[PDB]
Write an enzyme that holds these catalytic residues in place. Structure first.
Site, short mmCIF file in Angstrom:
data_model
loop_
_atom_site.label_atom_id
_atom_site.label_comp_id
_atom_site.label_asym_id
_atom_site.label_seq_id
_atom_site.Cartn_x
_atom_site.Cartn_y
_atom_site.Cartn_z
N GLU A 80 0.83 -1.21 0.00
CA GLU A 80 0.00 0.00 0.00
C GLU A 80 0.86 1.26 0.00
OE1 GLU A 80 -4.28 -1.15 1.79
OE2 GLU A 80 -2.86 -0.49 3.34
N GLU B 15 -6.58 -7.42 -0.63
CA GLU B 15 -7.08 -7.34 0.73
C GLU B 15 -8.54 -6.99 0.63
OE1 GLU B 15 -3.05 -5.02 2.40
OE2 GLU B 15 -5.04 -4.39 3.04
#
Lengths: 594, 590
Positions: A155, A237
């Site tokens: 991320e 995710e």
């Protein structure tokens, strides 16, 4: 190669859908790895995904640990034996609601820009990868293992845009022998996708989101189309639940709605459920959120409202997903899931107790210096830190101030509690009346309640714990400090033969007999704040503000025969008996949804 | 020796009362040094006292300046010529409502614990003293000069208890050949006296206070008695007024009450009036107070409600003290003081103007790096700093946040002002809708509004100015920065032939002719915020929040004939003409 990323995922030349669930090996005791992995396979899923926590594997610089609770290789083998593939996400930064986002705290003492293209930092990651990656290379699918692919950073688009940094991590992984496909994961909107990826360098891109798969996949597709990439869609995710923070209500998500949301992902592409089984942040390894300048520490339990609860048992959510799979993806065979039984035990009597102050020398080796030192400066990463100095009182009443301290401070003078200050309270005036003559002993117990694990406070000044500037008495900073680092990783060194006094941090021992060890929960609803140990293992933190008022005890933490629980309590609570329950005790907080 | 401290001060074998007044050479233009010192002598006083400002004398490491406005030797000589003695307080830290308490800002780039026994720090002070102290040793009374004694550190009891630090400073001074008596000054209560002194090593102790001489001297006396010292009593700083801060009311002290309080001191001991003449914090040299985590910047004027006003003219307070002296200490001869006259000049029109952005390249040499840098690490101590980056917009509206910036930030996108944030506002969400296509220019002008000069925030993280962490757009920190340091010490490089745009920081020039230069005040009531120059000399900061709305212009800053005043104004609020007035313009503060 057996596994390829083309216009689709291909496994042995055939289109392949990845059905993955996240299970972090370091959050589930190894004795229960099989159980959790089995339940993932039983759902019809084909892959397990896990982060690798740098701060666990290199807890002190140059000191590496890959065995026991940290035996990632064994975890992968158990998964392979169950016919599961693996995705490994071995980023130096994992976020993960985990202490400092996985970074070792000792980096905070180094002359380097953490999480950037700074060579000093890249070189530290390299030395870590030199130990970690060679353990994983033989476990790549093409080498006879089960690893399909690995993530580059994590991320990163939610932190920076240093492309040289991403390129360097990719390069390190390749140099270390990681020859499987690599990928990044980011929020599926333009800003994060642009900042976090190397799409122009043909590094596969995946997205993280918790709903609206059709919309979110469309944004990713637009991004792929813009760059002329023909790639499969994968949600790396899919946030299926919620983590919890002290003082904040537990929010849960409807099982059916979640199962529907998962179905939408699978209708268009591949998934990794985050989390499949969340487990526990044992010891001091919880992370911390931030809002502006304010830290919001996350709780010990990483139940997460996951498909399996903290203990590892299927929930209504697991069952809803199972039913969805049985209907819409019947080509994936399922099994009956496994349940563990829990136990309860009433009225376990207190056997011994001792004040922290009376067992200090056994627990901690003092570091003396003229000026006060910060936690990491002392070589400590986690736990508590006691600052001690001796001072003459120069007036009937004097003012004390702790300047730039974190996260929580308790002040005692000559063993008597004077004040407790948390976060922004630290620095407020404290008044006291010390010894008429000679020196008074001033003790300040500081706790590190968890370093922020993402975002703008990731490298905040407050990330270095302890007292950063000093302690003022009247108008001058005090000197001559003895520091007692208290990582509390050594409960065997608690000397219960020493004295106890009410109203001080103290250790309390409770002994009980167990015929057949089973999962259980230590009820701490009547205690204040601290940590608990069972048979020498740190279960994590408790705090009566809730929402969690228990600590989970895995069956594997218990022994047949004699067991001992030790409670370290800092707020003065005192109970002559404790109880273990079959289910967790919760604090109901306004705004919750159970 | 000619001067010694025993049971009393003895000068050439005779008991001596020190009647001192504080005048800081660096706060008064050298042309007016005689004026202020003469007025001190005229009061009947016998001694001048001054700090020495390290951050002025060593502006860059290894680069030393002791000439012109900084010619401390000349200041001392003028005092000697007038028959005045001198006390010099050459501490590395002077507090003094002065930038960073006098410490050079470049120390913030060093691996050292500032203001401690850390050898790295002591070694830096030593290198400074190697340049400063040999200039003062020949001016010691024993050597034919006028210096009676010198201070070791400054109110150290209000900061630490590191005795090795005090000892090191004392040792440095001795090793540089300083043979006169040395002393410390501190608050006259037990905690500060114990912490700030080396009484047990026979280092003379003085006290700082603003009233209650009998009580405060009694506390010093007890401390002396406790340690078996038979010493004279001296107040090394008798605070006779009040300094001022932006957005706070000007406080003044009754002249008669002050004169009475001074008498109390003199009946029992010696004194140094702080301040006798306060003068001005020219340029960016103001200090800054703290309350908890909050900084409170002090103003440009250091009038201080002192005996002489900012300009150097006797006040009612001067006269009240003079009357007290004539009545109760008639043995000290007095003189009629000197007054300077001021001038006024109406409606001086704007000649030309230019936006900061349009004259950047002549004013500043940019430094480029991937990550943003702080002011001091860029080699800059004072002034403004422009952060520039280019970025494209990834949504119709995006959020920007400045993470860990101080002290004040102004954000522009493609030259258009978006937001201003002061101190704790820095970090708040900024929402912007930018270029549909391509890169937009993001400019952030940061101001250093003065480093805290004492206390618990002296080494706070916020003391390093600029952006310490980064600038976030959406969730990611922006990279690739061009930094334009803007110390504004080069007004001659402002290119007024360049373009001007409304709603931007800009420079404004006003030309006028002067027959006979006289003191005056630049009225800035209608300008937002910035600094002003006269003939290239930085007068200091202005800010229409008040309480002060003017900048003092000493006569010596003006020239016969053509003069130019340049105003740098950051708020976009300006006037097409300026006025020079005989008295300063003030604003009432709620």
């Amino acid at each position: 190669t057996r596994f390829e990323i083309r216009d689709d995922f291909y496994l042995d030349g055939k289109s392949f859908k990845i059905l993955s669930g996240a299970i972090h090996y370091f959050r589930v005791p190894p004795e229960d790895w099989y159980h959790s992995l089995y339940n993932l396979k039983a759902l019809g899923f084909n892959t397990v995904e896990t982060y690798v926590a740098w701060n666990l594997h290199e807890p002190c610089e140059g000191e590496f640990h890959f065995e026991g609770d940290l035996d990632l290789e064994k975890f992968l083998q158990i998964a392979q034996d169950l016919g599961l593939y693996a995705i490994v996400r071995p980023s130096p930064f994992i976020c993960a609601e985990w202490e400092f986002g996985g970074l070792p705290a000792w980096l905070l003492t180094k002359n380097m820009r953490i999480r950037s293209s700074d060579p000093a930092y890249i070189e530290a990651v390299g030395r870590y990868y030199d130990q970690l990656l060679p353990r994983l290379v033989p476990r790549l699918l093409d080498n006879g293992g089960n690893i399909l692919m690995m993530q580059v950073e994590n991320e990163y688009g939610s932190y920076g845009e240093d492309k040289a940094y991403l390129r360097a991590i990719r390069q390190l992984m390749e140099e270390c022998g990681v020859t499987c496909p690599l990928f990044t994961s980011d929020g599926p909107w333009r800003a994060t996708l642009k900042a976090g990826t190397l799409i122009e360098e043909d590094l596969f891109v995946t997205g993280n989101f918790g709903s609206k798969a059709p919309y979110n996949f469309s944004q990713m597709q637009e991004f792929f189309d813009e760059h002329g990439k023909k790639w499969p869609l994968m949600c790396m995710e899919f946030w299926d639940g919620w983590f919890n923070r002290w003082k904040e209500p537990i929010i849960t998500r409807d099982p059916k709605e979640l199962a529907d949301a998962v179905r939408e992902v699978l209708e268009q592409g591949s998934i990794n459920l985050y989390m499949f089984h969340g487990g526990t942040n044992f010891g001091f390894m919880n992370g911390c959120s931030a809002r502006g300048t304010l830290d919001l520490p996350q709780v010990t339990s990483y139940d997460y409202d996951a498909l399996l609860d903290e203990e590892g048992n299927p929930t209504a959510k697991y069952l809803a997903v199972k039913k969805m799979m049985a209907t819409h993806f019947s080509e994936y065979p399922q099994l009956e899931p496994l349940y563990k039984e829990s136990m309860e035990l009433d009225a376990i009597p207190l056997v011994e107790k001792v004040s922290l102050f009376e067992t200090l020398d056994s627990l901690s080796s003092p570091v003396e210096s003229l000026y006060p030192q910060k936690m990491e400066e002392l070589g400590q990463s986690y736990g508590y830190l006691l600052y001690r100095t001796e001072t003459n009182w120069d007036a009937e009443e004097e003012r004390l101030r702790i300047i730039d301290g974190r996260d929580r401070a308790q002040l005692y003078v000559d063993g008597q509690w004077v004040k407790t200050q948390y976060q922004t309270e630290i620095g407020e005036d404290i008044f006291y009346q010390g010894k008429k003559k000679g020196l008074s002993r001033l003790d300040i117990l500081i706790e590190n309640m968890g370093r922020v694990n993402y975002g703008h406070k990731f490298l905040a000044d407050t990330q270095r714990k302890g007292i950063r500037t000093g302690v003022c008495k009247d108008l001058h900073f005090l000197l001559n400090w003895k520091h007692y680092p208290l990582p509390l990783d050594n409960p065997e060194k608690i000397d219960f033969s020493k004295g106890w006094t009410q109203g001080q941090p103290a250790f309390y021992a409770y002994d009980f007999t167990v015929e057949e060890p089973k999962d259980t929960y230590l009820d701490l609803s009547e205690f204040g704040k601290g940590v608990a140990f069972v048979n020498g293992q740190n279960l994590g933190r408790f705090w009566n503000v809730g929402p969690t008022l228990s600590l989970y005890i895995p069956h594997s933490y218990l022994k047949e025969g004699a067991n001992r629980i030790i409670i370290f309590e800092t707020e003065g609570q005192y109970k002559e008996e404790i109880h273990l329950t079959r289910k967790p005790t919760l604090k109901h907080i306004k705004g919750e949804n159970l």
